[PDB]
Design an enzyme around this catalytic site. Structure first.
Site, PDB file in Angstrom:
ATOM      1  N   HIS A 265     -57.802  -5.020  11.705  1.00 33.39           N
ATOM      2  CA  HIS A 265     -57.138  -3.808  11.228  1.00 33.39           C
ATOM      3  C   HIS A 265     -57.472  -3.463   9.783  1.00 33.39           C
ATOM      4  O   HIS A 265     -57.344  -2.303   9.399  1.00 33.39           O
ATOM      5  CB  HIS A 265     -55.627  -3.945  11.359  1.00 33.39           C
ATOM      6  CG  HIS A 265     -55.141  -3.751  12.752  1.00 33.39           C
ATOM      7  ND1 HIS A 265     -53.958  -3.112  13.054  1.00 33.39           N
ATOM      8  CD2 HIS A 265     -55.715  -4.064  13.932  1.00 33.39           C
ATOM      9  CE1 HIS A 265     -53.817  -3.067  14.362  1.00 33.39           C
ATOM     10  NE2 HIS A 265     -54.871  -3.630  14.917  1.00 33.39           N
TER      11      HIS A 265
ATOM     12  N   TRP B 271     -53.361 -12.005  27.164  1.00 28.76           N
ATOM     13  CA  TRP B 271     -54.595 -11.769  27.898  1.00 28.76           C
ATOM     14  C   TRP B 271     -55.124 -13.037  28.556  1.00 28.76           C
ATOM     15  O   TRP B 271     -55.562 -12.992  29.709  1.00 28.76           O
ATOM     16  CB  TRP B 271     -55.647 -11.153  26.978  1.00 28.76           C
ATOM     17  CG  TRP B 271     -55.231  -9.829  26.406  1.00 28.76           C
ATOM     18  CD1 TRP B 271     -55.279  -8.616  27.022  1.00 28.76           C
ATOM     19  CD2 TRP B 271     -54.688  -9.592  25.105  1.00 28.76           C
ATOM     20  NE1 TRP B 271     -54.804  -7.637  26.186  1.00 28.76           N
ATOM     21  CE2 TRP B 271     -54.432  -8.215  25.002  1.00 28.76           C
ATOM     22  CE3 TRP B 271     -54.392 -10.412  24.016  1.00 28.76           C
ATOM     23  CZ2 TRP B 271     -53.912  -7.640  23.851  1.00 28.76           C
ATOM     24  CZ3 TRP B 271     -53.874  -9.840  22.880  1.00 28.76           C
ATOM     25  CH2 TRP B 271     -53.640  -8.468  22.804  1.00 28.76           C
TER      26      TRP B 271
HETATM   27  C1  HEM Z   1     -59.374  -0.282  22.264  1.00 29.30           C
HETATM   28  C2  HEM Z   1     -59.331  -1.339  21.452  1.00 29.30           C
HETATM   29  C3  HEM Z   1     -58.048  -2.125  21.111  1.00 29.30           C
HETATM   30  C4  HEM Z   1     -56.786  -1.865  21.429  1.00 29.30           C
HETATM   31  C5  HEM Z   1     -56.237  -0.662  22.228  1.00 29.30           C
HETATM   32  C6  HEM Z   1     -55.971  -2.915  20.877  1.00 29.30           C
HETATM   33  C7  HEM Z   1     -54.623  -3.023  20.970  1.00 29.30           C
HETATM   34  C8  HEM Z   1     -53.942  -4.154  20.623  1.00 29.30           C
HETATM   35  C9  HEM Z   1     -52.517  -4.257  20.636  1.00 29.30           C
HETATM   36  C10 HEM Z   1     -51.576  -3.104  21.063  1.00 29.30           C
HETATM   37  C11 HEM Z   1     -52.206  -5.481  20.225  1.00 29.30           C
HETATM   38  C12 HEM Z   1     -50.840  -6.191  20.060  1.00 29.30           C
HETATM   39  C13 HEM Z   1     -49.766  -5.366  19.366  1.00 29.30           C
HETATM   40  C14 HEM Z   1     -48.487  -6.153  19.264  1.00 29.30           C
HETATM   41  O1  HEM Z   1     -48.507  -7.312  18.806  1.00 29.30           O
HETATM   42  O2  HEM Z   1     -47.429  -5.620  19.649  1.00 29.30           O
HETATM   43  C15 HEM Z   1     -53.425  -6.177  19.971  1.00 29.30           C
HETATM   44  C16 HEM Z   1     -53.434  -7.479  19.549  1.00 29.30           C
HETATM   45  C17 HEM Z   1     -54.531  -8.162  19.143  1.00 29.30           C
HETATM   46  N1  HEM Z   1     -55.747  -7.564  18.941  1.00 29.30           N
HETATM   47 FE1  HEM Z   1     -56.318  -5.841  19.812  1.00 29.30          FE
HETATM   48  N2  HEM Z   1     -56.762  -3.829  20.237  1.00 29.30           N
HETATM   49  C18 HEM Z   1     -58.045  -3.359  20.358  1.00 29.30           C
HETATM   50  C19 HEM Z   1     -59.144  -3.976  19.840  1.00 29.30           C
HETATM   51  C20 HEM Z   1     -59.138  -5.200  19.224  1.00 29.30           C
HETATM   52  C21 HEM Z   1     -60.255  -5.736  18.475  1.00 29.30           C
HETATM   53  C22 HEM Z   1     -61.586  -4.988  18.240  1.00 29.30           C
HETATM   54  C23 HEM Z   1     -59.894  -6.931  17.996  1.00 29.30           C
HETATM   55  C24 HEM Z   1     -60.675  -7.974  17.146  1.00 29.30           C
HETATM   56  C25 HEM Z   1     -61.996  -8.121  17.159  1.00 29.30           C
HETATM   57  C26 HEM Z   1     -58.560  -7.196  18.478  1.00 29.30           C
HETATM   58  C27 HEM Z   1     -57.893  -8.356  18.211  1.00 29.30           C
HETATM   59  C28 HEM Z   1     -56.591  -8.559  18.525  1.00 29.30           C
HETATM   60  C29 HEM Z   1     -55.879  -9.812  18.495  1.00 29.30           C
HETATM   61  C30 HEM Z   1     -56.412 -11.205  18.113  1.00 29.30           C
HETATM   62  C31 HEM Z   1     -54.635  -9.579  18.855  1.00 29.30           C
HETATM   63  C32 HEM Z   1     -53.560 -10.692  18.943  1.00 29.30           C
HETATM   64  C33 HEM Z   1     -52.534 -10.524  17.830  1.00 29.30           C
HETATM   65  C34 HEM Z   1     -51.561 -11.676  17.852  1.00 29.30           C
HETATM   66  O3  HEM Z   1     -51.798 -12.668  18.552  1.00 29.30           O
HETATM   67  O4  HEM Z   1     -50.516 -11.635  17.176  1.00 29.30           O
HETATM   68  N3  HEM Z   1     -58.106  -6.126  19.220  1.00 29.30           N
HETATM   69  N4  HEM Z   1     -54.490  -5.346  20.206  1.00 29.30           N
END
Ligand code: HEM
Ligand code: HEM
EC number: 1.11.1.21
Lengths: 717, 717
Positions: free
Chosen positions: A85, A298
């Protein structure tokens, strides 16, 4: 409405709402910088102990904190969402956003809906910023917490670059017109997103995780994923690599109703100490966390790297359901894989779920072909996530000379716009003198020399530090054929001539001295400004720093370079079609991208005009009767109250200035006239238009010009 | 509601509209200054041939320009109104306004309604500024032009000092809450005018030339004038002298309908080159000019100094009438004075006329005897006018050391808060350093030492440059019992303990070296700070500069030192009633008056906390366990996440910080917590809370403490 105390926001913007805002030309003023003037962050980072920083980070990742306990007892995933982010605000149209300034700690980004919970995420690293102090910036630390998270959980990254300088006042970026969080007023036509924006809604990094406008249709969501990511320098393979490899870790948070969640950080009460989004649901944290309102896990190994994500995406079928807060998400049909997914705090297992956007990797045919190959050949995924994650959290670092540390790989990467290394002895003071004179004899005019030199260097922009004269790329595609640089062809005659001079110098040189084309382009404009100062009765030398080298077409990404073309350049009185605002606002924005102050901007306009640098050599603003002479005539005539100005009758964006006889003496654009009209710029014009001002005018113009010629020369700093 | 591009004024103020605005602490940033860093205006204006300047301004005054023809062939009266309006924004409550910065050339003053057609007045002085260049500021020039005009037309002035440095960006000042020009939202009760304003409507200098809210009641307009002028520091006699004095010259302009008069300069089109109020009535200038709407010409000698004003005011009876623009004004009864008043362009000549504001001079009781006297004693008028006009125009120039040029009379004046010059000699380094011990060896603690020093210096506001520590005025009224200064505490005890040692050091009799009280108040806090720093393992030396001298109660206008009483000073955690904005805003505001940068405000608060500087030595913010040690403790504990803040149940506007065990360990106010909440402040805190930060914090603290001790020391420049 009501006028407020300046300490509460009030100002002249409230009385003239669309007035030019010169505060864009003094961002991060030294008055607000707490470090000394001698402070060089690059020098601090060069002495940091990386292997100690890493362990102190891994020590933080595995030490839960009661105010935000760690899923699966590991913060790694959270820091990946944090680094992604931080980098993920970058956009290609204006190079702005990104991680390079640490801007996620300041408003508005620290309070963006999509940055929910990252307030807590950054807080957890204060113990790290504190132990390392001035040797480690927040900008470096934030992005490094993710690269450490990956390596710690099984994924060996490609390397890493330190050197992001912390700032103290947030950069102001236009993120959209919508005055409502998650508003959407940014599309027209057939799903055409408003430039320069790179997210589908106000407050999102990229796309809506419930699909377009909240419609959980994977196949449509993918159009948005494709295009917002494109606008962030990511093609199909890079995007899939990114989404897949990211969601190999961690989990979503949506344990309860989202209307129990308090105000964003910048809007929170004092007692919360910069933290926001405080929740009355349960513990308001941990097992009861509410971040997005979705609730997905996931993989079955949320804190290790493996091929689980794609194994799971393809090894179940998916149906639409609601999370505990009511958000769309998918689950494996027919109760498949029940109890197979581990819980963040030890509870019973759960069953697989994906987001709409995750299904888009399978439902979209381009993305299916990419991800199915990685299902069968996961080692290909590792290689592509390495590359794309590197690109992502470094895209705005600028030239490689700026990458510091022992984890900086030595390989050339096309997206960095590489420049070759110096191969010979650089050109000394005696050869620089010889070459200024050889160029002055070549037959190129002052206007040709100064336009070419400006066109090459002004391609720099300070948002992401792409562009500039180093590389020699004004003679490569696409810069040779930008409309601004080459209206009618003079550019290739200049190029031809400068290459003959470089060739004949290099074949006669003493010993092993060699000059690059890139240097002679800049040297020529310095040679013409000297000649043209002499013509005005000033004997002055223009500084020059050799060191540029010549990139090759093969080493120059033509489409990547496309975003750097000026649709407007007020220093050459150029206004192309389709800019978001009138010419004077674009001038300031161009001044901002060149890191220029108002005095520096003012002096370069006036000089460039009388030097003949105008696009197509038009007479707009050329308020002088001298040819190829560096005077301050622009400023004097702008202040001549014996000229009367009216909009030209042909409504062509030009103005007519008449002298006493009623005859037309000068013509001008909106960019010229704003210096005589805007009461702050006119103040500056009165400095340079006084009788005692011509020597100061010359000196300050040389300094500003030298500053533009060196904008990308991090190889010498 | 729609967010706009930054270049057009957009920013985080749009998303959180009452947020804390820190640019208030970096007005006039250096990168916006076109002059060098080494630009030395005092060293420039000293070179000026003052006689040639006067002569040049004189040639301006008598050469009508065709784009704004000159009434009676002399721009003298216009230039005086110009000068009166440049100074006439001053107000005693904050010392903001006044001609000291030349702010009339910038927004919003350049576009205020009462400042109509002065854009052409300033434009006429361009040939002078052009001739003298950097040796003469617009600020000096605007004001000096009005003085020259007086002399030109027969009034010898008391004198004139130069030295007002030009600034390059507006000072943003609260001028009221109204979002309409001429609007009125500032009056409660019966005639109570909101502080800290000094005019009756938005965009006026003082009052409404048609009486209050357009009611031409001279007796009621007199209440406004009195209260209005008193807030700009003029009493009944000064005020009557200025109105009579000014309206000896010139006339008003209201020749036709005011709706024929175009937009004001900041909303006017580019081609008008900084000018505004363009007018489609007739020629739009000259005999057809329209400025206020009133059409009165006071005297029959509009370009000469006479007594005709008072002989007209009293030699006629005034009945009500209307100018050609619906304007309330006064004219002679019975057709008296037919034709006796001359026309500015060779017209036929008119009857006598006055303003409602004018009749207040004859209708009000107190003004009527001031004036009736002068009707027979114009020598007293002349003498009071020059006394008052001189003050009107130098009010904000600070200590008289600042007055430059050959035109400064040496007469001491009481409103200048005079300080006796260094009579005897001053303490050398072995005398100062031998003298700190005798303060340390006193029942005086750091708490009383460091504080009382602060209370002295902190007296300074940068707005009008009044107050400060020089003068020894803490011993004197009203700084004696300023509710902030003594909760009936050790101040006298430290005062007389210091006088005790004043009497003691001078009586010693080593030679010429006598020691001032004022200088020791300051010296106390310095050595205190040195002890604290050794109490924390730093052998440190706090700079100190002698030169202060102690004034006498007889030389200390008590009613003029009232407005310098802090109704708030966050730096000692004080907060009286009446402050218009929450604590944190008045913290920022007071730091602005101290000319402090956000890095400076922060390091200061942090140090003064850990030194008991606090009003009534209260524990709020004292996040350290040491006493009279100089640490960064305040920052380290502010960043301690093991502390949990919540408002104090007692709702005293305080907070408690429990350490998880549930026991309150720290307490604080808003002023204290805003440093851990506000995203930009916390960034600073995190520089000075880090592990490697302790030396730099002390280093930065001494520098910032030095700055506040030396604020009024223009006597050493
Ligand atoms: C269309 C692309 C993407 C969408 C729609 C998306 C959406 C989200 C959302 C909604 C969350 C969790 C929000 C919450 O905690 O309530 C999330 C978590 C996360 N995202 Fe994605 N994301 C995208 C791409 C990515 C990318 C490019 C990365 C890193 C290379 C990424 C890494 C992560 C990780 C590691 C989490 C886990 C957070 C945690 O464990 O606390 N995401 N993503
Ligand atoms: C209650 C106080 C005052 C009021 C209400 C007032 C009002 C006015 C107004 C309405 C005008 C008309 C401008 C125009 O239409 O052209 C004017 C002009 C003028 N004022 Fe005053 N004024 C006040 C005090 C003063 C003072 C204190 C001075 C100087 C010491 C002064 C000097 C002048 C002069 C010289 C002009 C003539 C300018 C010219 O000829 O263009 N006035 N005043």
């Amino acid at each position: 409405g009501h006028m407020k105390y300046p300490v509460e926001g009030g100002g002249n913007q409230d009385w003239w709402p669309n007035r030019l805002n010169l505060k864009v030309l003094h961002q991060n003023p030294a008055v607000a910088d707490p470090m000394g003037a001698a402070f060089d962050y690059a020098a601090e980072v060069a002495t940091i102990d990386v292997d100690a920083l890493t362990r102190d980070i891994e020590e933080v990742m595995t030490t839960s904190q009661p105010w935000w306990p760690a899923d699966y007892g590991h913060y790694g995933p959270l820091f990946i969402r944090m680094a992604w982010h931080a980098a993920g605000t970058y956009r290609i149209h204006d190079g702005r956003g990104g991680a390079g300034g640490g801007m996620q700690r300041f408003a508005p980004l620290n309070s963006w809906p999509d940055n929910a919970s990252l307030d807590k995420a950054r807080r957890l690293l204060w113990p790290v910023k504190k132990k390392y102090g001035k040797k480690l910036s927040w900008a470096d630390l934030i992005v490094f917490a993710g690269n450490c998270a990956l390596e710690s959980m099984g994924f060996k990254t490609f390397g890493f670059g330190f050197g992001r300088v912390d700032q103290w006042e947030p950069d102001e970026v236009y993120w959209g017109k919508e005055a409502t969080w998650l508003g959407d007023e940014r599309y027209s036509g057939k799903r055409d997103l408003e430039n320069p924006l790179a997210a589908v809604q106000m407050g999102l990094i990229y796309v809506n995780p419930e699909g377009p406008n909240g419609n959980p249709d994977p196949m449509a969501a993918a159009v948005d994923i494709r295009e917002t990511f494109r606008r962030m320098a990511m093609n199909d393979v890079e995007t899939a690599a990114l989404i897949v490899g990211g969601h190999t870790f961690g989990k979503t948070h949506g344990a309860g109703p989202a209307d129990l969640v308090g105000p964003e950080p910048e809007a929170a009460p004092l007692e919360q100490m910069g933290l926001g989004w405080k929740s009355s649901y349960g513990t308001g944290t941990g097992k009861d966390a509410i971040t997005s309102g979705i609730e997905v896990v996931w993989t079955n190994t949320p804190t290790k790297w493996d091929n689980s994500f794609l194994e799971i995406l393809y090894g179940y079928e998916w149906e639409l359901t609601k999370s505990p807060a009511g958000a769309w998400q998918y689950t494996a049909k027919d109760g498949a894989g029940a109890g197979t997914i581990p819980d963040p705090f030890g509870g019973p297992g759960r069953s697989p779920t994906m987001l709409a956007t995750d299904l888009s990797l399978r439902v979209d045919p381009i993305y299916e072909r990419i991800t199915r190959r990685w299902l069968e050949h996961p080692e290909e995924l590792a290689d592509e996530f390495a590359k794309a994650w590197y690109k992502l959290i470094h895209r705005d670092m600028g030239p490689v000379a700026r990458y510091l540390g022992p984890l900086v790989p030595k390989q050339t990467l096309l997206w960095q716009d590489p420049v070759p290394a110096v191969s010979h002895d650089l050109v000394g003071e005696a050869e620089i003198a010889s070459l200024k004179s050889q160029i002055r004899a070549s037959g190129l005019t002052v206007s040709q020399l100064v336009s070419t030199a400006w066109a090459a260097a002004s391609s720099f922009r300070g948002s992401d530090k792409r562009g500039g004269a180093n590389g020699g790329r004004i003679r490569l595609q696409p810069q040779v054929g930008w409309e601004v640089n080459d209206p009618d062809g003079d550019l290739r005659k200049v190029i031809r001539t400068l290459e003959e001079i470089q060739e004949s110098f290099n074949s006669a040189a003493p010993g092993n001295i060699k000059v690059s084309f890139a240097d002679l382009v800049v040297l020529g404009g310095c040679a013409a400004i000297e000649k043209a100062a002499k013509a005005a009765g000033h004997n002055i030398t223009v500084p020059f720093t050799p060191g540029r080298t010549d990139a090759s077409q093969e080493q120059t990404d033509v489409e990547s370079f496309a975003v750097l073309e000026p649709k407007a350049d007020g220093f050459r009185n150029y206004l192309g079609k389709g800019n978001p605002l009138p010419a004077e606002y674009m001038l300031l924005d161009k001044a901002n991208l060149l890191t220029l102050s108002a005095p520096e901007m003012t002096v370069l306009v006036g000089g460039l005009r009388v030097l003949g640098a105008n696009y197509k050599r038009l007479p707009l603003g050329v308020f002088t009767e001298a040819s190829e002479s560096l005077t301050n005539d622009f400023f004097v005539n702008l202040l001549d109250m014996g000229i009367t100005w009216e909009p030209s009758p042909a409504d062509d964006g030009t103005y007519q200035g008449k002298d006493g006889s009623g005859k037309v003496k000068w013509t001008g654009s909106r960019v010229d006239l704003v210096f005589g009209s805007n009461s702050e710029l006119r103040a500056l014009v009165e400095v340079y238009g006084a009788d005692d001002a011509q020597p100061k005018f010359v000196q300050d113009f040389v300094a500003a010009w030298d500053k533009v010629m060196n904008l990308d020369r991090f190889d010498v700093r």
